């Protein structure tokens, strides 16, 4: 079954024994899930358990070469959504996307890779708009990057807290 | 008794990175070289890559040439599967041919998957180039690639 990866992670991140919860340590660092997707439409959820002052998260999708010692969205291998101001990040360019998210929010992550690629982010079930289209081809892993000591939990499915309306996908847990 | 094949396989995967390296070769271009003595019958390196069904090799050759990518780096496992290391692979891509080689290839099955592993045919000493016999099909006179392996029992051509 799908978990946060055992070796494919920054070492400084504090990951729970069940491997679904992760706490940040100092500068931005990243963990990928154990499974990735190449085609089709897929979904997973992240809950912000705790976001103390001066902490942040950049969440989204990463290819295997995305740098583990940088925020998600740092390089060409990943696309991210920042808790602060809801900025979307790719190749370290941050663009206007949505408003911010924080403690208690449940964030939804959709990707479609048709066999016209898209990445769409959700906040508590509400589509926040297409963030990126025609993305690089490759294998995309659910990915978490945290700036200091905040805490997030990832849900790969099959059951989601805020399953989006009028959106077809498979839960990431179908890869398990 | 001998070690179970999967245990020999992790040890290889764990230690091959520090025992071999790629350098310029007196035989041809770049080759794989020995950085620590290797005992006879030990695993040297896996020929790693994308494992494809044999039927897909034809489609992939024509694709590689259409993009003007140069030569393919495909090693056949058996009649049914091939390891394609053209775009995804490891340092085993660079092992040159020798008419008197110090390595050989062997297919091993680990957890229902097949792997090409290069084995030391004899004790190999650091600084030796690692080579095996390509065993190319005997080709006609029109396209016979000459051999530069530098041995005295050299066959003059790869095919």
């Amino acid at each position: 079954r799908v978990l946060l990866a055992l070796h494919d992670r920054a070492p400084q991140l504090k990951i729970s024994d069940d491997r679904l919860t992760v706490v940040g340590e100092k500068g931005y660092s990243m963990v990928r899930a154990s499974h990735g997707v190449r085609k089709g439409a897929w979904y997973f959820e992240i809950t912000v358990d705790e976001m103390p002052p001066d902490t942040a998260a950049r969440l989204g999708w990463s290819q295997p070469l995305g740098n583990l010692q940088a925020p998600l969205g740092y390089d060409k291998f990943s696309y991210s959504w920042r808790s602060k101001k809801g900025t979307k990040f790719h190749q370290s360019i941050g663009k206007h996307y949505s408003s911010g998210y924080g403690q208690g929010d449940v964030l939804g992550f959709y990707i479609n890779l048709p066999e016209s690629s898209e990445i769409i982010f959700y906040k508590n079930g509400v589509n926040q708009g297409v963030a990126y289209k025609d993305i690089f081809e490759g294998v995309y892993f659910p990915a978490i990057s945290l700036y200091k000591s905040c805490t997030v939990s990832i849900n790969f499915g099959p059951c989601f807290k805020y399953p989006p309306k009028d959106l077809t996908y498979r839960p990431m847990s179908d890869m398990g | 008794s001998d070690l179970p094949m999967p245990m020999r396989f992790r040890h290889l995967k764990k230690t091959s990175k520090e025992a071999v390296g790629v350098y310029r070769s007196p035989i041809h271009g770049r080759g794989l070289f020995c950085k620590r003595n290797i005992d006879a019958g030990e695993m040297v390196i896996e020929y790693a890559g994308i494992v494809i069904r044999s039927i897909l090799t034809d489609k992939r050759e024509k694709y590689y040439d259409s993009k003007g990518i140069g030569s393919s780096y495909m090693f056949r496992i058996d009649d049914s599967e091939v390891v394609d290391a053209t775009m995804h692979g490891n340092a085993a891509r660079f092992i040159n041919h020798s008419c008197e080689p110090n390595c050989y290839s062997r297919v091993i099955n680990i957890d229902g998957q097949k792997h090409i592993v290069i084995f030391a045919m004899r004790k190999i000493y650091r600084g030796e180039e690692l080579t095996y016999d390509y065993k190319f099909p005997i080709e006609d006179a029109s396209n016979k690639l000459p051999c530069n392996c530098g041995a005295k029992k050299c066959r003059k051509f790869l095919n």
Partner: peptide, 19 residues
Amino acid sequence: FKELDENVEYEERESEFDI
């Protein structure tokens, strides 16, 4: 070529053989 440490099985598409 991207370096690889372990073999990867190609996952063919449904349309792998089509024009």
